Amino acid sequence: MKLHELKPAEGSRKERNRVGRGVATGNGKTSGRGHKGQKARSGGGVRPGFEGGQLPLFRRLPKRGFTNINRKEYAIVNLDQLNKFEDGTEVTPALLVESGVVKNEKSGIKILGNGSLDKKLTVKAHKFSASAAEAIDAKGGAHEV
Amino acid sequence: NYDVLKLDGTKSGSIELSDAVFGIEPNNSVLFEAINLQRASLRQGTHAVKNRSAVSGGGRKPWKQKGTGRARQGTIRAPQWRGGGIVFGPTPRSYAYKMPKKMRRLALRSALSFKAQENGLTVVDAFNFEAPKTKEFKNVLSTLEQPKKVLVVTENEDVNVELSARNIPGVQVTTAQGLNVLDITNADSLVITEAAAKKVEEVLG
Amino acid sequence: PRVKGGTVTRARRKKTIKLAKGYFGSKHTLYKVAKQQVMKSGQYAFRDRRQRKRDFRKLWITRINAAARQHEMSYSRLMNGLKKAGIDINRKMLSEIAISDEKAFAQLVTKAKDAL
Amino acid sequence: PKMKTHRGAAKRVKRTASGQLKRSRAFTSHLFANKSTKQKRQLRKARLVSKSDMKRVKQL
RNA sequence: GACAAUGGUAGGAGAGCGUUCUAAGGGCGUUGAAGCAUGAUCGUAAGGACAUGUGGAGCGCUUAGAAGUGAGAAUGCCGGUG
RNA sequence: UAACUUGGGAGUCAGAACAUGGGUGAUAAGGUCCGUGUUCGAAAGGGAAACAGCCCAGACCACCAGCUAAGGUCCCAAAAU
RNA sequence: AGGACGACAUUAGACGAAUCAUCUGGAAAGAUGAAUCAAAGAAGGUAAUAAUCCUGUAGUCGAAAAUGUUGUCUCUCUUGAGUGGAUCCUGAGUACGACGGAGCACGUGAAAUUCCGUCGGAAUCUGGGAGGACCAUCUCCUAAGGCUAAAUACUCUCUAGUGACCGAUAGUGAACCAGUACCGUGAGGGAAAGGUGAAAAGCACCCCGGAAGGGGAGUGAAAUAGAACCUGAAACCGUGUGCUUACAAGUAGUCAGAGCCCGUUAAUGGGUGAUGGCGUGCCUUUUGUAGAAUGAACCGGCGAGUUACGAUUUGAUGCAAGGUUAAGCAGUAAAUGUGGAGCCGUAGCGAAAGCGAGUCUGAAUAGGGCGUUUAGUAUUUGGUCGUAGACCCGAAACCAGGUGAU
Ligand SMILES: [Mg+2]
Ligand SMILES: [Mg+2]
Ligand SMILES: [Mg+2]
Ligand SMILES: [Mg+2]
Ligand SMILES: [Mg+2]
Ligand SMILES: [Mg+2]
Ligand SMILES: [Mg+2]
Ligand SMILES: [Mg+2]
Ligand SMILES: [Mg+2]
Ligand SMILES: [Mg+2]
Ligand SMILES: [Mg+2]
Ligand SMILES: [Mg+2]
Ligand SMILES: [Mg+2]
Ligand SMILES: [Mg+2]
Ligand SMILES: [Mg+2]
Ligand SMILES: [Mg+2]
Ligand SMILES: [Mg+2]
Ligand SMILES: [Mg+2]
Ligand SMILES: [Mg+2]
Ligand SMILES: [Mg+2]
Ligand SMILES: [Mg+2]
Ligand SMILES: [Mg+2]
Ligand SMILES: [Mg+2]
Ligand SMILES: [Mg+2]
Ligand SMILES: [Mg+2]
Ligand SMILES: [Mg+2]
Ligand SMILES: [Mg+2]
Ligand SMILES: [Mg+2]
Ligand SMILES: [Mg+2]
Q1: Could you tell me if C48 and C40 are in contact, meaning their C-beta atoms sit under 8 angstroms apart?
Q2: CA distance B188 to C43
Q3: How far is the centre of ligand 3, averaged over its atoms, from the C-alpha of B202 (Å)?
Q4: Where are the domains of chain C?
Q5: What is the largest CA-CA distance in chain A?
Q6: DSSP at B155
Q7: What's the CA gap between A16 and C2, in Å, rounded?
Q8: In this complex, is the C-beta atom of A45 within 8 Å of any C-beta atom belonging to chain D?
Q9: Does A60 touch chain D (CB under 8 A)?
Q10: Which of B15, B61, B100, C34 has the fewest CB within 10 Å, making it most exposed?
Q11: Which string of b and e fits A19-39 if b means at least 16 CB within 10 Å?
């Protein structure tokens, strides 16, 4: 609080050990390396994943696949998140952003259904899922896919 | 929840406008990563040494090798000579990290609530004087009594209050949008105008 | 902030040299060899404080057995009879009786001899 | 400089916790036993992800 | 009051003293500061004091930071003396 | 009184002598190579004259206290001529 | 495309406010008391530590002259909009292609775009190209001729500043008449070396000595501060001394303990030691060392896990199905205001289309693998990885560019 008696957080400042500064620290004369060999030399260290001449794990396993050039990533809003608002007017790619639900939808905002609609709501989405399109027409409401 | 107002020697009408910013129990460990931040940010880290590379000379190999009977010494400017070369000097770097924007206000609403919730705060009404008179302000600090460390705050500017009180040891004159966190706990006594006091809750809460 | 070893050293080595006085020759005047000799002198000090308990109850066994056979009793038959006499005394006392004041020890040898 | 993954990770897919290889010994000889040719599905990698979890870090 | 446990290398895990600088608070200093020498004192260790000489001007103590932070060995480097 | 599952940090991949089951060697080695135990390595004390590996036994520090283990009891040197 | 008419900035410098008295002291700026300015309590000097003693600072002014920004006018200059498009021109050995090759992140491969070499080589507005070979359709734009400010990269210097940067083995190699002595034929290497005091007051004179030095006297607070000059530690070489040593076998001690001498940070006191037990230094390296294995002549000083950027982990602290800013722009080189481009998370499965609380292989709703039931996120103290020289010190050796046949 005041300057002349400020106390730190409660188990947050630990001081770092200087290694190789005396035989009575637990890191004496050799500072954690060992005695000789590859690791104990200065700057030595094997590349990660190198079994010593034996070919590594990522040469035996074969490769497969290719990604895409157009892999349209729908921002998957679940159906449970709609159970917060009211009046049932619309849901909208101009509104469903700015109620904080979705952000940076790549292309299309699909309604996957894993919650409960619980309201006679009216949507206007991009494209649908099969089971969740039953839930909107369950309690009553159209759209524009 | 009702701070009493004085004007220049006289009691007057006061306000209650201290609700959320003035009154939170002070979260101290939030402050310790804010008082440490600013004072490890004021200073320009500019300090270097020349390591084994950039010193002058050293292409010679002085002894040869086998035969002479000295060490296996390599150059003239290796570190263990009395010449230069320092293996682990200070690299010129920068000392600057940051807290998130919610923590960055929660320290500041905890700093001045350390003042109001226990031992010390005063709100005065505004005061103007055109000619810069230092003596006409050291007069004022001893009527409504404060100790040596004292902080005055104008609402956005002062052509005189920023330019008086700049000679006295222990006084800082800070515009209300320049409210940092070291001085507000370095001081012991907030004396603010009544025009900025309504603004600091309208800008921190 | 460069910091060099300003007198964390010569205020440290002159509590080894000053702690090592009276050694022969050039092992009381200079650090690098006289640090070794004090460093053994503790290693002896831990060792031989387990010899004063192995030497003084080797002294008292002599000066009891020198005084036990001044009364036709060997040492081995003595403390067998003394333990059967129910005498829970040490040896250091049984020394210090038998060298200052014989007339106490003159009948103490009887009681052990009379239990047998 | 940023940690540079190496592109032997065209051969592994992050499942939700563990890796996923594709089982070796695919082509170039099928003078080999018939119920062992039926083993062509994929397995998750073992606990030698200790030796490689600084190599495949940005596939996430 | 018990009750058990405490050899120890490579190595893993905690608690600690000291050196230089800054920030804040609080002090000692020509009625003699820092270093230097001497002493039978205090703490479980690293270490902390206090008198007395020499010394002629800038230092501690608590809290908290940042590191060019600790010496006995490298046929180490430099300067002295055998 | 341990065990196992997960997650950070390693070190070792130059072993040796005894006691026994074996190959090689010549029922040769303080040899080499496996099994299986102990101790040393990483363990100071007491005995084996001295002596890393054999025999007793595991040192948190103090004391001028007592019993005992392995080995001993005429003298050097504690204890039975 | 040149040049007269007229406001600032540089290159010197002015003014610039507020105090005394006592005490110890060689001397006060210190202590104690009594005052005063303050747009001036930055900084240094003065016989010690000064807001008020000096030089200064805040704030104000000045410029014969000569340059740089430049505002104004004066001058040069200068017609710009529409329609018809029935004809005429739009950058030739060019674009392209074949052949070897370089660049494009792209190693000639499925290889567009781009320039060079050799050789063949077009059409022109119904044209001509380009949308990762090529053809078709659709959108975009007109090569083979030129010119161009600002955002941005640098300091051998110049001006004014700042520093949890060093204080003479550090800092530049170089505080000191430094790239100098000095070594080399040469190209090129490349050091050491700071401090009297406040002021020179730098020892008049007397004495021994040829002088150098020295003892008195003398200056000075101090010459035990004497021009090798503040402070003066260790190795090491010396001077009289209290205890002790010439029948003795020794990694130099330690634990017992006699006799004689001294009296303390006054405590179960300090130094010396006739005689007994006990006993083969230290570090590296080893299956193992007193080792006849290595390393150290001794004493000082210097000398080895560091930083930036990331990744993953526990410990901390905000917020909660939500958390979060980058560059920039304002601002005591203030760490605080704005900036929601982005990143991560709330849903996975499969190579992919696509499907979704479940998909995938599959003829199957059969059986399986991976999921579902919710905690992630931002910054930071630790431990460890990666890229950088990345714990220090050491090689023969390679490739450029030069100097040498005395
Ligand atoms: Mg260890
Ligand atoms: Mg060592
Ligand atoms: Mg190793
Ligand atoms: Mg080593
Ligand atoms: Mg090895
Ligand atoms: Mg290297
Ligand atoms: Mg040192
Ligand atoms: Mg232990
Ligand atoms: Mg550790
Ligand atoms: Mg100092
Ligand atoms: Mg040395
Ligand atoms: Mg030599
Ligand atoms: Mg044999
Ligand atoms: Mg065996
Ligand atoms: Mg063991
Ligand atoms: Mg023996
Ligand atoms: Mg003997
Ligand atoms: Mg003046
Ligand atoms: Mg003045
Ligand atoms: Mg080609
Ligand atoms: Mg010096
Ligand atoms: Mg010179
Ligand atoms: Mg005088
Ligand atoms: Mg001396
Ligand atoms: Mg002998
Ligand atoms: Mg070993
Ligand atoms: Mg020898
Ligand atoms: Mg040698
Ligand atoms: Mg010739």
Answers
A1: no
A2: 60
A3: 64
A4: 1-116
A5: 79
A6: S
A7: 19
A8: no
A9: yes
A10: B100
A11: eeeeeeeebeeeeeeeeeeee
